Design a protein around this nucleic acid. Structure first.
Ligand code: ZN
Ligand code: ZN
Length: 50
RNA sequence: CUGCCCUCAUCCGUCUCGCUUAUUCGGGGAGCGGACGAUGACCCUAGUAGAGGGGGCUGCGGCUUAGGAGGGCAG
């Protein structure tokens, strides 16, 4: 499926999911952190203590 | 304008800090705004402009870019 050029995340041409301006929520989120680029926890639970 | 970091994460501790609130108002109680701190990670390379590697996300096609808003610093 050569859909290159048409975004599927939002549905707007010119860019793709990788460059989707709506890239934030409503996706999947396995166990990564899109706030500190962390690998394991979630952004919603991303924070520091000591 | 771009990079990084922090805050909204119904987060925490600190702050002679600011605001609001209590039968629409003050150095206390609480919530929020600002600073500090979970790239677990950045470093290196050759022909140092810039470019690439794992690496950013992806419908794998890729491009190598940018990603909601406010503050600090750098050019
Ligand atoms: Zn899009
Ligand atoms: Zn995180």
């Amino acid at each position: 499926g050569r859909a290159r050029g048409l975004c599927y995340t939002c549905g707007s041409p010119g860019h793709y999911q990788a460059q989707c301006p709506k890239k934030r929520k409503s996706g999947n989120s396995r166990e990564r952190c899109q706030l500190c680029n962390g690998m394991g926890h979630n952004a919603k639970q991303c924070r520091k203590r000591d």
